[PDB]
Amino acid sequence: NIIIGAMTALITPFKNGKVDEQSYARLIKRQIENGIDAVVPVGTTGESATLTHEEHRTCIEIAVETCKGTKVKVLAGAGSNATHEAVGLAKFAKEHGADGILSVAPYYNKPTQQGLYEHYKAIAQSVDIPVLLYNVPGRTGCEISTDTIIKLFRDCENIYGVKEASGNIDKCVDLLAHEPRMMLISGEDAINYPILSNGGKGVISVTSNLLPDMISALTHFALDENYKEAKKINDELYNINKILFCESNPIPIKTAMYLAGLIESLEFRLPLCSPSKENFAKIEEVMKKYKIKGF
Amino acid sequence: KNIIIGAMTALITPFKNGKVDEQSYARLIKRQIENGIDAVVPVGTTGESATLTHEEHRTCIEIAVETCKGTKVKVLAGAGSNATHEAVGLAKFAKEHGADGILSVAPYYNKPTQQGLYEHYKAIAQSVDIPVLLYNVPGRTGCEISTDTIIKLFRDCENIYGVKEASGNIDKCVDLLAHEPRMMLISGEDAINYPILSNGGKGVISVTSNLLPDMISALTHFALDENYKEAKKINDELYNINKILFCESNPIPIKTAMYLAGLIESLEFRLPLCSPSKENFAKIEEVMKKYKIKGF
Amino acid sequence: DKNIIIGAMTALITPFKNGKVDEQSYARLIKRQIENGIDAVVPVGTTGESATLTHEEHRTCIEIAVETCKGTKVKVLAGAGSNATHEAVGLAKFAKEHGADGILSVAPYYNKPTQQGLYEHYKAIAQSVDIPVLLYNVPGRTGCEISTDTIIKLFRDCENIYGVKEASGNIDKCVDLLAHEPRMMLISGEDAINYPILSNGGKGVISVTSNLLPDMISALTHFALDENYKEAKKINDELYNINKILFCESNPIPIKTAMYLAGLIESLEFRLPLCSPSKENFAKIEEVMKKYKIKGF
Amino acid sequence: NIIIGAMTALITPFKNGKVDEQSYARLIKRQIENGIDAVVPVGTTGESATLTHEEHRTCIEIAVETCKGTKVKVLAGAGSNATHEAVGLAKFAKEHGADGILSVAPYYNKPTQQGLYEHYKAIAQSVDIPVLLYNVPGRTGCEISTDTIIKLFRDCENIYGVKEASGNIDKCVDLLAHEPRMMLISGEDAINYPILSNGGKGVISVTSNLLPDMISALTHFALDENYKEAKKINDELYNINKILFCESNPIPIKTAMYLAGLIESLEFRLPLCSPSKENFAKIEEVMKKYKIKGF
Ligand SMILES: [Cl-]
Ligand SMILES: [Cl-]
Incomplete structure (x- = not known):
């Protein structure tokens, strides 16, 4: 029992400091289509x-x-970085009807x-639904x-x-050479294709918020081992894949979604905030090179 | 500016049967004071x-x-907190409960600009009218x-x-006090307490002081008194214990040390933290033998 | 277009016998690669x-x-x-004069040019020369x-x-390179990740492992070049263990130890500051070695 | 027998590509005085x-x-990164009158x-004169x-x-807590004072090329245990100490020396070269805040 393929790490749009629930549903429908x-x-x-437990439940x-x-x-x-809470959140996700859970490695307290x-x-x-590990040491400290x-x-x-976001293709080889039965998932858009071509079985994407059709085609080509087509899309996406991290994700992708008119308000919750004007300009310029689907 | 400086201790939180050992906690604080x-x-x-609850947070404070x-x-x-609305709430919370100031860590995991x-x-x-000390520890927060x-x-x-600095970067310590000599630089890294202090740092927030409060107290005050020879001597003597207390992630070794010393009753953590490996346990036990550990 | 040197390539060890380049051994080793x-x-x-070689020994090996x-x-x-441009120009001229088809030219080490x-x-x-030049990026060794x-x-x-020969463990950069300049010959300088580099359009490898297992590195590269990615990955996965262990100590200390243990060279000699491995890494090398089929002469 | 106190890593001025011997001697006299x-x-x-063996001899x-x-x-x-050459250079140096040698850890070949x-x-x-180790991992790779x-x-x-250029005050404490008899020398100008205050016994300086009187005063104040004055100079120097590494040393120091009129042309040997226009301008502006001794 697994969850693989082309996956989207959904942005959470805000309007007047609240979660825009209609927009959230509309964005999800767009990904489906x-x-x-x-x-x-x-x-x-x-x-x-920065989301409360109840906003957590609402989005799920x-x-x-x-x-x-x-x-x-x-x-x-x-x-969570507290196990008692992570277990609680896992249980709640199952109860809310989730097919599975993505569970980040504890941040900040650096467990052994x-x-x-x-x-x-x-x-x-604690649950009987699929669990996908998530490694992102640049954020967690472990x-x-x-x-x-x-x-x-x-x-x-x-x-x-495991979802890998570690910029380490050696580790991807290490993992799948010793345990080829596991599902390795790319958590790093720029190298989606190299992870997939080594036997990875999906992506959890940031870029797909903006270009879901391109990421979907990339992944599905790769899963069928049509590597020429998959590489072509991956090479085409490189510039947007990099610029979407000129500042900490999700600041660039929400900026891009706003510039494309896909969300109403460029709102974050502190300590996240609007990009610098310089990076705002870079994102706008790079966007011009791509064909963005509407609703 | 109202300030909070000198020899300061990052208090461990003792557990007994999964609960905060409140009596032990009070006793350990009194030991630091004296x-x-x-x-x-x-x-x-x-x-x-x-891994503490809001309520346990309150109790400890x-x-x-x-x-x-x-x-x-x-x-x-x-x-x-890595959520500002939560950080603001926690700050007001601490003030309401009698805190003289707050230590506030840089948001972890979400990597703000x-x-x-x-x-x-x-x-x-x-949100508060009490002193605020910044806390930089990029190895833990990712920023x-x-x-x-x-x-x-x-x-x-x-x-x-x-600011409390835990970044192993004495260049940054120079930068800070050369451009703003009025600020209170605090060492958050015990092994280099003396170099930070000798460059004009005005205190430490120590891990080692849980076990050896008198030695850390003396180090700090000697430095503050510009008796750099005595401050350096103590820093040199403490180097071994200072490093061994991070053979695994803090506070796993310091709690192990306190338990070995008989200063806390039970070696308990809350997951994802846990006991050290058997080997590291033995290393901590060995290094401790070379230090005089004050009792209650 | 350009003029190129690609495919499966071996970074030759230099056998020493009593402190001197064993020229007979060197030649025999090269024939083993060819075959x-x-x-x-x-x-x-x-x-x-x-x-640690002299200019003259450099000449001789070439x-x-x-x-x-x-x-x-x-x-x-x-x-x-070289990290000195005037010496590097000189060395490239020597190599040309002695019949080399191209040169591998490492980024200036230690003095960190901009x-x-x-x-x-x-x-x-x-x-300065008319023959192909392959760049060589290895920041862990050069500092740049x-x-x-x-x-x-x-x-x-x-x-x-x-x-360029890349030894930076950075597949993001490899995507960047070939996305913007698809005419480029990207060459793997890191055996462990030979397959991922080749599958993104790299056109060859410069291998350490191939000193010991030239048939396996050859097969891998040619399968990749023929776009048989299933087979190329399988060999890459099989080789991962020896590919890493050959770096348990700084290359070429493990590969030279392997070649000696396999009976492919007569003496295990290094020039200081390089030296024999710890006797436990020695056993470790012997261990991983005996798990692969090693071709003789 | 030891070589300590305030010391200068001498630039080598070029005149039309050749070692400028008149300039070199002039500059050393300025250091001494x-x-x-x-x-x-x-x-x-x-x-x-980039120097030849004969130029090596000439400068010594x-x-x-x-x-x-x-x-x-x-x-x-x-x-050198070849032991037979390093031994040759050490003897060479002794033969031509050096009081001791500075010997960098082998670069590029990563010995154990x-x-x-x-x-x-x-x-x-191989020589009976003092030897100072030189650790600079950022350049050597070891x-x-x-x-x-x-x-x-x-x-x-x-x-x-040992001359330490590793930005690691923790290692400086380790070294001298365990072996207090060794001469720890700062190879990192910005942190000269912290190294000296922990028991270092000298510096080998880049900055002293430009500001020899200030680096000397810094070092001798600290050796006199006058830490207040030593720190004052170190704080004042922080900005020039940092800009002198905006590009790889010695590119900025030669630029500053040229700007100050202490060398008559801005010449390097490839692969070293002039700084960018932008960094050239930054160096010039930082220099304005300091008194630079002439000849
Ligand atoms: Cl995510
Ligand atoms: Cl090589």
Whole structure:
């Protein structure tokens, strides 16, 4: 039981300091109609850190209810750097009808590999839906080592893979050479194709908020091993893939979504804020080179 | 600016059967006080803030405030978050419960820009009328408060009075005090307490002082008295214990040390933190043998 | 178009016997590479202990390579590089004169030139010989990084600069390079990630592992070039373990130890500051070695 | 026998591509007359990499001749990533009158700690003059570990300390807490005072090329345990200390020397070259805040 393919880390639009629930649903429908296989509510791109527990529940519910009747799945953001909370969020995600959960490695308190193992073991035992690990040491301050990922995959039936955001293709080789049964997922848009061509089985994308049809086609080409076409799209997307991180995600992608008229208000919750005017200009310029689908 | 400086301790939070050991916590604070510590920091990183509840947060601060009352030892409360609205709430919370000031860590995980950081700490500084000390620890948070942002916050905001640095970067320490000599630079990295102090730092927020408060207190005060030879001697002697206390992520080794010393009853953490490996346990036990550990 | 040296290539070790280059052994080693499908050999690279050879020994290894590859399709891509531009120009001239088909020229180490400096460094070299020049980026060893913009500028401004050997563990950069300059010959300088580099359109490898297992590195590269990505990945996955262990200590200390343990060279000798591995890494090398099928002479 | 106090990593001025010997001697005289305790010919700052063996000899000879009759010492650059060459250069240096040698850790070929030990041991045993280790991992790609440094200091009588350029005050505490008899020398101008205040016994300076009187005063104030004055100069110097590394040393220091009229042309040897217009301008503006001694 897995969740793979072309996936989108959904932005959370704000209007007057509240979550825009109609817009959120409209953005999700747009992803569905462009060939996305799953959506990820309240991940990093969705500003998970600044959303209350109830806004958390609301976004997941909207995702679950919008994807009903389609083949698109809901991979819910549900993680924490306190295990008792991560377990609680996992349970709530399951209850809200999520198909599975994405669970980030504990940030800031830097647990040991043993602590990481016990953390994810607690979570995976608490629910009977698929759990995808998420490694992003640049944000968390810690790494889930290759050994710990493989142990967790083998010891817990519902832990089925890992989202990697670590800019380390050696590790991707290491992982799939020693445990080829796991689902490696790209969490780094610029290198979607290299991760996929080495046996990765999906992406959880930032760029796909803006260009869902391009990311969908990239992933599906790759899954069918049509690597010429997949590489072509990956090479085409490189500039937008890099510029969407000229400042910390999701600041550029929300700026881009706003400039494309896909969201009403360029609002963040502090400590996140509008990009510098310089980067705002860079994002605008790069956007001109791409064909953006509306609703 | 009202300031909170000198020899300060990042308090561990003892657990017994999964609950905060409130009696033990009070006893440990009194031990710090009577060993020359000038301020205590409840519910910081070393206190496992990330796994404590709002209620336990409150309890710890209240015990600190109560134990320190009548002494002139201050309570620099842990109150920080990667959500600004939460950080503001925690700050007001700490003030309401008697804290003399707050230590507020740079937002972790969501990596705000320098502009976002400035506006984060500005919102915090405006919500309370008590001293605010910034806290930079990029290895844990995934972001850095630049010297420029620190200096601007210090100058623009009356109650922002300095920064706790845990970045292993003595170049940055020079930069800070060469451009803004009025700020209070605080060492948040025990192994280099003396170099930071000798360049004009005005205090430490220590991990090691949990175990050896008298030695850290002495180091700090010797430095403050410009007796650099005695301050350096102590810093040199403490190097071994200072490094071993980070063989695994803080506060895993310091809690192990306190338990081995008999200063806390149970070696308990809350997940995702846990006991050290058996090997690291033995290393900590060995290094401790070379130091005189004050009791209660 | 350009004039190129691509495919499966070996960074030759330099066997010493009683402190001197064993020229007979060197030649025998090169024939072993040829017979096992290798497309080119790199004499006196990092893996050949370039730093500790004299100019004359440099000369000799290149001659042996060229002479042994005569009457075969196998090319000689000679190590010729320095952190001093005037020496680098000199070395490139020597290599040309002794029959090399091209040169491998490492980025200036230790003195950390700026990007402008790197551009002028390589321009000077490329305009001094008529033969192909492969850039070589390895920031972990040199202390500097040739940026993508600089590499592309050099490719476009100098006729005989035809690509770059990357040893930076940075697949993002590899995407950047070939997306903006698809004519570029991107060459893997990191055995562990040979397949990912080739699958993004890299056209060859300069390998350490191939000293010991030239048939496997050859097969991998040719399968990749023939767009059989299933087979190329399988061999890359199989080789991952030896590919990493060969770096348990700084290259070429493990590969030279492997070659000796396999009986492919007579003596295990290094030139200081390089030296034999710890006796435990020694057992580790023996261990991983015996898990692969090693071709003889 | 040791070589400590305020020391200068001498630039090597070129005149139409050739070593400017008149300028070199002039510059050394200026260093001496401003309280410098030793000069370092043909180090990194002197573009050691691009000079020939004869130019190496020339520079050392000029330094030795210029210092004659004074107590100023010549600590000659003499090092290589090939041990047989490093030994040759060490002997060479002794033969031409150097008081001691500065010997950089092997660059590019990344020897093991064991190899580093045998490298420096061979050097130390080939000359009977002081040897100062030189650790600068950002340039070499390797690190002389604290243990290896202390081993070399203890095992070899004439190895008397290390020049550290690694931006790591933690390592400076480790070195001197365990081996207080060694001479720790600052190779990082910006943090000269913190290194000295922890028991360092000198500097090998880039900045002192431009401001020899200030670096000298800094160093001797600290050696006099007058830490207030030593820190005051270090704080005042921070801005020039930092801009002198906006591009790779010695590119900024030669630019400043040229701007100050201390050398008559801005010449390098490839692969080194002039700075960008932007950095050229920044260096000029930072210089305006300091009093620069003439001849
Ligand atoms: Cl995300
Ligand atoms: Cl090589």
